[PDB]
Design a protein around this ligand. Sequence first.
Ligand code: P99
Ligand code: P99
Ligand code: GLU
Ligand code: GLU
Ligand code: ZN
Ligand code: ZN
Ligand code: ZN
Ligand code: ZN
Lengths: 258, 258
Amino acid sequence: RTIVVTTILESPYVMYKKNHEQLEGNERYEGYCVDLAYEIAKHVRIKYKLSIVGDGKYGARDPETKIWNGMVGELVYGRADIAVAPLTITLVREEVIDFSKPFMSLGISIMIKKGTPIESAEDLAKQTEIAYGTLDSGSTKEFFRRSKIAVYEKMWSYMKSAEPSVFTKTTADGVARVRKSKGKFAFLLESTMNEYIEQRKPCDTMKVGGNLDSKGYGVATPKGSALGNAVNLAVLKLNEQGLLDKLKNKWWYDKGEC
Amino acid sequence: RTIVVTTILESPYVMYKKNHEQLEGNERYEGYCVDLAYEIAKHVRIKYKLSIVGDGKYGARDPETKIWNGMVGELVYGRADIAVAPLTITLVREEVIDFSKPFMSLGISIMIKKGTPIESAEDLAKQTEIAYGTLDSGSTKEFFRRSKIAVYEKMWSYMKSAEPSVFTKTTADGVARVRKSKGKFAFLLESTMNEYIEQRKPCDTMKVGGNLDSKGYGVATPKGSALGNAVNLAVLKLNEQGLLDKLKNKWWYDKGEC
Ligand SMILES: NC(=O)COc1c(F)cc(SCCNS(=O)(=O)c2ccccc2)cc1F
Ligand SMILES: NC(=O)COc1c(F)cc(SCCNS(=O)(=O)c2ccccc2)cc1F
Ligand SMILES: N[C@@H](CCC(=O)O)C(=O)O
Ligand SMILES: N[C@@H](CCC(=O)O)C(=O)O
Ligand SMILES: [Zn+2]
Ligand SMILES: [Zn+2]
Ligand SMILES: [Zn+2]
Ligand SMILES: [Zn+2]
């Protein structure tokens, strides 16, 4: 009866409540995906336990050992029944799991410290004073690894050898690093996150240029699990009801500091 | 599995959402008791259906036909499994139902249009220019009917014959009547409600003086129902957790307009 939903600590999707140690279970967290979990659980009528992924990753297949980590592994190895979070819909992932219809829209985007003299991928690629990175074990890193567009080819071979490593264990590490860096570190992340951080004090970061690509997050299920159907039917309803929009404003813009 | 919770449309305990016709079931409502229902249902782990009482009353025993109306009847006649709402803990009611430990504190209080020359019960009682009333089929009306304190004796025999009737079908009718009345109608209600309306535009009403008495609202159960135990254990926990307070600010003060 308690279906476990894997998920990840990422702001403002899921974050501990101010004072969370006061509470227990699902009540410990608050966020966009935390609101999304509840109300899906409300529409497919199910008991659920939010479970934050142990390794704190999204999910990439280890090239050598062939295993899946992050929330994607959770599902694949029968540890989670469902994933509510900012998990990008990807081909390599669709081969091993199910996605609902995307519940949010994003693209890869450049995050800069304010003032940094950069506007575009090409701007980043054609120089070497400003360093740049991405989240490790996510779809952004994979996008650059997989790409055969020349500018991205260049930006990839650079990162792949950059020392120290330009791949971060978390999103907050990139952000912290963009901010500590005095303009010598750009950080490639999803524009959803990017715009979240743009609205956060101390208001010293921003998105520059268009997204390199256009995709979305989906709720995920183990492959062929019978629960995909309902889950997806609930997403499509939340959209038509106007409720994803409501939550998106609530978490990013209404809370907005800059 | 779906335990029905009887409850009543009273602001800000339970109120339709802005545009509610967009939604269905429990999602149609929002309010303090709506938040309280959920999270009790969360702590005793139960599926529930919010059900707004048909006659829209609290509960009084008809003197003649001996029957109970309002949410209290619901419980007594096995129609509701539980009552989440501003139901005052009373002796006559405790004889026929169970109350948790009170989840909120109130007292009877005078509501006046701003400017009205009234400060106290005695002030009301000793004059006849300003008319005054209360909610029909509630504990306030009963309090005055039951009282043997002289000033309340006087205020009762007055009301009991006042034409037109000074007993209102709803709280909003008293309020509307206090506001339409240009200072010639005071309205006796619970200080919780009173302070809610004091914080509502157009900010032309207020509480005057102390409460005539001190009591509280409890979550109610059919008499000896096995569900009292848990329910009460959940209330005591919400209190110690600081969560009733949180909700009380959220619904009355943080939303405050005056
Ligand atoms: N909350 C929403 O309504 C957002 O939904 C959408 C949407 F309506 C359209 C798109 S187009 C971008 C590609 N579609 S995708 O994300 O399902 C995808 C991703 C990777 C490979 C193939 C298809 C995106 C949304 F998020
Ligand atoms: N949210 C809260 O903590 C409010 O709880 C309380 C409380 F702690 C004390 C009182 S004293 C007033 C009388 N106690 S009663 O309401 O349980 C009652 C009512 C009628 C006859 C006998 C006893 C009130 C609270 F609401
Ligand atoms: N949403 C990405 C993680 C963030 C990123 O790679 O920028 C994923 O599902 O892997
Ligand atoms: N809370 C009261 C209704 C309001 C009033 O009588 O002022 C009751 O339970 O009956
Ligand atoms: Zn902790
Ligand atoms: Zn809903
Ligand atoms: Zn309606
Ligand atoms: Zn709780």
